[PDB]
């Protein structure tokens, strides 16, 4: 089968800047009949895939012409002009030349913008939870760029690396920022036993950790 | 309006199988040639086969061949798939595609997609999430503005919808991917309001859950 290489593997632009995405293939994409069947395809983030390109250079209807792609045998690119906030996701080449259809893995364009700091908000458990016997303690950090972020727990001043759990969203076509969640699971009887609960941060937008706690107690 | 409608969530025990459906409506549905591509943690495609409606001939990937048999129904506009014997690498997302090559022609009409139709391959019981409201304290911004959470825990298998009023509120939402940990997934959404709506008006978590018909609304209480 034909491999596709693609590169990067990820690229991080500013809106109005130009991107080109290379495309590789382990044999010339020539077909026979003088054709090359390459296409281009963009999967924004929680749809399904959309072709741009076909025949390596032809527009799909509908599409910007801020998109241009060329190449030929074994070398193909895919190049936007102008970078838009529409563009983000993952751009993929995929040969129809040799059977059976082949994709490259994927180029994930990444809008660049300033540096934004986390928001953070920590929660307790709710009663309801505590009720069943079981206490999570919840920290959202929204709204940040770069995506690069270290979040540690702190109980007590001791670091507690086992119960956590790490959830984060893709890059937000809105703001262009990225956010998470942090979950710290114990049970009812050890969450009782402490006393401050912290959600520590470790971002580009600070020389010192970002900090976020609540002491529980009684009245 | 050319639309692609698939089937639902799957979750399907190892060694069984199940039938995918891919519902077309706006164009005549035996003169294109119709699809299926797979898709793995995200960036991970792959061509399965096409088939085309019109004389029910078909043409599949190698690898495929005995996992994967297309059909047609004529006379309602389906495609379908159905995938034996799952495995463990048969848990994946497979669209379906009105590709749109023109073979005749030499060039291509628009490709249209179904939204997709995910397939978790599992012995694992169906479970019921518990939902808690998060109200803050600390998380609260202080003035201003102030954020309110749902955390959604210990549901199988995917998917859960997770709404705030109804629908009715989505600015300054975030819903965060579930994650699995010991069987079970945890999902949390957070909404940023203005100190002056909550909690002056009430703010609610809606989650459904298809798979257990679980159906609840937690009122974040101060
Ligand atoms: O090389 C060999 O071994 C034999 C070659 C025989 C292959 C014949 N090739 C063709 O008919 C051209 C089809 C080109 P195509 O762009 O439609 O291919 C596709 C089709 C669906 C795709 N998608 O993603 O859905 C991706 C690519
Ligand atoms: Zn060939
Ligand atoms: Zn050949
Ligand atoms: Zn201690
Ligand atoms: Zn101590
Ligand atoms: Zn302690
Ligand atoms: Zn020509
Ligand atoms: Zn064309």
């Known amino acids: 089968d034909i491999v596709m290489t693609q590169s990067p593997l990820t690229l991080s632009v500013t809106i109005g800047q130009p991107a080109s995405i290379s495309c590789k293939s382990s044999?010339?994409?020539?077909?026979?009949?003088?054709?090359?069947?390459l296409n281009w395809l963009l999967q924004r983030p929680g749809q399904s895939p959309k072709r741009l390109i076909h025949?390596?250079?032809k527009l799909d209807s509908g599409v910007p012409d801020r998109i241009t792609g060329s190449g030929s045998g074994t070398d193909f690119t895919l190049k936007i002009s102008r970078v838009e906030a529409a563009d983000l996701g993952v751009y993929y080449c995929?040969?129809?030349?040799?059977?059976?259809?082949?994709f490259g893995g994927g180029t994930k364009l990444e809008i660049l913008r300033a540096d934004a700091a986390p928001t953070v908000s920590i929660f307790p458990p709710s009663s309801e939870q505590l009720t069943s016997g079981g206490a999570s303690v919840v920290c959202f950090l929204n709204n940040f760029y770069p995506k690069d972020i270290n979040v540690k727990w702190k109980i007590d001043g001791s670091e507690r690396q086992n119960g956590v759990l790490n959830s984060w969203t893709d890059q937000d076509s809105k703001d262009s920022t990225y956010s998470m969640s942090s979950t710290l699971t114990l049970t009812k009887d050890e969450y009782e036993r402490h006393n401050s609960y912290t959600c520590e941060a470790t971002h580009k937008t600070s020389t010192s950790p970002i900090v976020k706690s609540f002491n529980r107690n009684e009245c | 309006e050319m639309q692609l409608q698939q089937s639902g969530a799957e979750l399907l025990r190892p060694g069984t199988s199940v039938k995918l459906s891919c519902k077309t409506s706006?164009?005549?549905?035996?003169?294109?040639?119709i699809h299926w591509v797979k898709q793995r943690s995200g960036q991970g495609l792959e061509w399965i086969a096409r088939?085309?409606?019109?004389?029910?001939?078909?043409y599949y990937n190698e690898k495929f061949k005995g996992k994967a048999t297309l059909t047609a129904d004529k006379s309602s506009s389906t495609a379908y798939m159905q995938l034996s014997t799952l495995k463990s690498e048969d848990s994946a997302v497979y669209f379906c595609?009105?590709?749109?090559?023109?073979?005749?022609?030499?060039?291509?009409?628009?490709?249209?997609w179904g939204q997709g139709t995910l397939v978790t391959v599992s012995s694992a019981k169906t479970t019921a999430p518990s939902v808690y409201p998060l109200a803050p304290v600390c998380g609260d911004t202080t003035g201003s503005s102030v954020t309110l959470g749902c955390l959604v825990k210990g549901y199988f298998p995917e998917p859960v919808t997770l709404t705030w009023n109804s629908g009715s509120l989505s600015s300054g939402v975030h819903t965060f991917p579930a994650v699995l940990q010991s069987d079970l997934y945890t999902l949390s959404s957070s909404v940023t309001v203005t100190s002056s709506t909550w909690p002056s008006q009430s703010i609610t978590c809606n989650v459904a859950h298809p798979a257990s018909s679980t159906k609840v609304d937690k009122k974040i209480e101060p």
């Open positions: 595609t009105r590709w749109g090559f023109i073979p005749v022609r030499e060039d291509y009409v628009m490709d249209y």
């Open positions: 706006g164009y005549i549905f035996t003169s294109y040639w």
């Open positions: 088939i085309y409606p019109g004389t029910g001939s078909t």
């Open positions: 044999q010339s994409l020539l077909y026979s009949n003088g054709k090359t069947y």
């Open positions: 025949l390596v250079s």
């Open positions: 995929v040969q129809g030349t040799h059977f059976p259809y082949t």
